[PDB]
C-alpha cells in the first residue's frame with residue numbers, strides 16, 4: 001500500500017479541484033518501468049475518508065475498475081492511481097459528438113462488466129455516474145471514485161445510511177438502503193447521460209421534483225438517436241421495485257448481446 005514520496009513526481013498543473021483537494025498528473029517509479037499516475041491530493045475526517053477509499057480499492061482487481069497504486073503521506077495524504085488519459089466520460093462525449101452509438105454501447109457495456117464484478121465482490125459504489133467513468137482510450141472505460149463505496153455485511157445485501165439524488169434509486173431516498181440494485185438504478189442514469197453525450201440528467205429540475213416525477217412512474221425520455229434497445233434497458237434499470245429490478249449479471253448480459261448484434265450489423 002505505502003509508496004515512497006521520492007519515487008513520485010507531480011506536475012504543477014492540476015487536472016481537477018474541489019473541497020477535498022486536487023487531482024494531479026504525475027509519475028511513479030515502478031520496479032522497472034515509470035508509470036504515469038493520477039494523484040488525489042487532500043486539502044481529521046478527510047484523511048479517514050481517503051484511507052477508507054484506499055481500503056476499498058485495495059480489494060478490487062478488474063480491467064474496468066481504476067487501479068490504485070498506493071497511498072503516500074507527505075505534504076498531504078495522497079492516493080495514487082493509474083491514469084486514464086482521456087478523462088471523465090461525460091466531458092469526453094460533450095466534446096466528441098461524433099462518437100458513434102456502437103462505441104457508446106461498447107463503453108457502457110464495459111462499465112456493466114466492472115459493475116458485475118463489483119456486485120460479485122459485494123461492494124456498493126453509491127456514486128455511479130458518467131462523471132465517474134474515466135476513459136483510458138475512446139474504446140476503454142474504467143469506473144472510478146470509490147469515496148462513497150461500502151463493503152456489504154456478510155449477512156445483508158444492502159448498506160443502510162450531500163447525496164447525488166438524481167442518480168439515486170427511490171429506496172435510497174425512502175429507506176436509506178443502498179445495494180447493487182440501487183447501483184443498477186444509477187447505471188440506468190449513467191446510460192442516459194452517455195447516450196445524451198454527457199448532458200446532465202433531469203435538466204432544470206430540483207431533486208425534490210425528480211423524486212416526485214419518479215414516484216408517479218414518470219421517466220426521462222429517449223435521447224435523440226439512442227437505440228430503442230438501450231432506452232428499454234434504461235427503463236429496466238429504473239424499475240421502482242427492488243426485487244424485480246435486474247442485477248448487474250442480467251444487465252451485463254443484455255448489453256453484451258446487444259453489442260454483439262451491433263458488431264454483426266457493422267460487418268454486414
Ligand SMILES: Cc1ccc(NC(=O)c2ccc(CN3CCN(C)CC3)cc2)cc1Nc1nccc(-c2cccnc2)n1
Pocket residue numbers: 015016017018023038040066081082083084085086087088134144145
Ligand atoms: C485525465 C483526467 C482529466 C481530469 C480528471 N479530473 C478529475 O479527476 C476531476 C476531479 C474533481 C472534479 C470535481 N468537479 C469540479 C469541476 N466540475 C464542474 C465537475 C465536478 C471533476 C473532475 C481526471 C483525469 N484522469 C484520471 N485518471 C485516473 C484516475 C482519476 C481519478 C480522478 C478522481 C478520483 N479518482 C481517480 N482521474
